[PDB]
Amino acid sequence: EEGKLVIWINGDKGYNGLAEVGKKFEKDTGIKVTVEHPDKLEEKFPQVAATGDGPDIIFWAHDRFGGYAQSGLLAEITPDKAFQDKLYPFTWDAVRYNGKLIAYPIAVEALSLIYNKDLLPNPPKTWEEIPALDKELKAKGKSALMFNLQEPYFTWPLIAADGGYAFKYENGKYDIKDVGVDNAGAKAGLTFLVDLIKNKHMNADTDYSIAEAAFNKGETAMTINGPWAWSNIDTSKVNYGVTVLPTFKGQPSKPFVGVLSAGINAASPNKELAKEFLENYLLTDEGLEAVNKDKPLGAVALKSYEEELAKDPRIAATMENAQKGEIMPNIPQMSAFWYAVRTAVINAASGRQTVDEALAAAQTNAAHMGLSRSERKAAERVRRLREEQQRERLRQVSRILRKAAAERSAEEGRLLAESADLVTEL
Numbered sequence: 001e002e003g004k005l006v007i008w009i010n011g012d013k014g015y016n017g018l019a020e021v022g023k024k025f026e027k028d029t030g031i032k033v034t035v036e037h038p039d040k041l042e043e044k045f046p047q048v049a050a051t052g053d054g055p056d057i058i059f060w061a062h063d064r065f066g067g068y069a070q071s072g073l074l075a076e077i078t079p080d081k082a083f084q085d086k087l088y089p090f091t092w093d094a095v096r097y098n099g100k101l102i103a104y105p106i107a108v109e110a111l112s113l114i115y116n117k118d119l120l121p122n123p124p125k126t127w128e129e130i131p132a133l134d135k136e137l138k139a140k141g142k143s144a145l146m147f148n149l150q151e152p153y154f155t156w157p158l159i160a161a162d163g164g165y166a167f168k169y170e171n172g173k174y175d176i177k178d179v180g181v182d183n184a185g186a187k188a189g190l191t192f193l194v195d196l197i198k199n200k201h202m203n204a205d206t207d208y209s210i211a212e213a214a215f216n217k218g219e220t221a222m223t224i225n226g227p228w229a230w231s232n233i234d235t236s237k238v239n240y241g242v243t244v245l246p247t248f249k250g251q252p253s254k255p256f257v258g259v260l261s262a263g264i265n266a267a268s269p270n271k272e273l274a275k276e277f278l279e280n281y282l283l284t285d286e287g288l289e290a291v292n293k294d295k296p297l298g299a300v301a302l303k304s305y306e307e308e309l310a311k312d313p314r315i316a317a318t319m320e321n322a323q324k325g326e327i328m329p330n331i332p333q334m335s336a337f338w339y340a341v342r343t344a345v346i347n348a349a350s351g352r353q354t355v356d357e358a359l360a361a362a363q364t365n366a367a368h369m370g371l372s373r374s375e376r377k378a379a380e381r382v383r384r385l386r387e388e389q390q391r392e393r394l395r396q397v398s399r400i401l402r403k404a405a406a407e408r409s410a411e412e413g414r415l416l417a418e419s420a421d422l423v424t425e426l
C-alpha cells in the first residue's frame, strides 16, 4: 500500500518506542507509520512476501536475511559512504550477503548471565558449580538458574563452548557441508544441560515466560537473556547484575552474536520512504534512544550513540559475551541449522532421545538441507494462488454461459470461445 509504512518487529523488542519514531516521521511527512509485532514474523515474511504482500520494513536478527535475499524478497538498500561511516564496519558485514548489503544493522545482541545480587552477590564463573549452587538455594526455597530451553539460541553458548559449531569460515568462504553439531564438544555441552535436568536443577518445559517470571519474582537466582529483557526486570523488585556467561570445562560460553537488522521489502512501493525513515529518523541518536528507552537494544550499531551506552556495565557485559562468541552467519542454511538444533535440544532435554541420538539426528538433518521450510510453503503459496485462478476461470465460464449471448461482453464472448470443450460439457 502506497503512502504508508508498515513495520514488523519482534514482540520482545521495543515496538512502542519504534512507533514513537514513526509518529515523528508521520509528523514531518504525513505518512502514517504502522508498527506491528506478529508472532513468528520471521516465518510469515518469507511466505507472504513471496506473493508480494507483507510489511514495508522487517526487523530481525541478521541471520535470517540471507535466506530472504537469496529468495529475492529484499529490496536494494543504498546507503552512501557517509552514512555507512556512522555504523560499525562489522555490523555492515553481518548484513552483507554475497558482497551485497541486504539490510540496515540496528543493534548488536548477545546473551549474558543475569543474576540476583541479593540472592547471589557473587555469581558463579563456571557452569560446573551451578548444580551445588542450586542444591544450596533449594534449601531456601529458591533455584540457581532458569532460562529458555525451547529456543536453541539460549543453549547454544553452552553447546559451542567445548567445540560445537555451525558453519566454519575458511578461504573466504563457508563450508556448508562442515557442520559441527555432533562432535565431542557439542555432546559434552548438551550432556551437561541434560544432567542438570536429570538432577532436578532445571525442567525441560522451561520457556521464555516461565524463566522470566521466576527471575523477576525472585524465585530463581540467575537467568540467561538479552538486553531486551532488562526493561521487565527494572519494573520488578529484583536488584540484578549483568555479567559474563559461566565457563564450561575451562572454556567460555560462545553465544551466537545477533545483529538486529531492518530490511526493506522488495514488493514495497515505498522504498525511498523506508530509506528516509531508517537513515534519517531511526538510525539517529534520538531515534535509537526512543527505541532503547522502551526495550534496550544492547550495543547499538550507531557509533555516536554506542559511545554513551558503552559506559553502562550491562552493555559492557553484553559486549564481553559478544566478543567471546561468533557472529551469526547470514547464509540461507542458517534456518535449517537452527531447526535441527532446536529439535535436538528439546528431544534430549525431555528424555525422549539421548544426547548422542539427538545430536546425530541434528547432524544428519544438517547433511540434508534443501530446500528451507520457508522456501517450501512459500512455493506452495504460489501454487495455491495459481490454483485459485483455475477455479475462478471455471467460475466465469459457467457464469457467462448462464448469460444470454446477446448480453455477453466482448471479453466474455472471447473467453468463452477458447474453452469450447469445457463449454460443451457445461
Ligand SMILES: OC[C@H]1O[C@H](O[C@H]2[C@H](O)[C@@H](O)[C@@H](O)O[C@@H]2CO)[C@H](O)[C@@H](O)[C@@H]1O
Pocket: 010, 012, 042, 061, 062, 063, 064, 109, 151, 152, 153, 154, 226, 228, 258, 338
Ligand atoms: O533459537 C533459534 C533462533 O535464534 C535467534 O533468535 C533469537 C534472536 O536473535 C534474539 O533477538 C531473540 O530476541 O529472539 C531469538 C531467541 O529466541 C536467531 O536470530 C533466529 O533466527 C533463530 O531461529
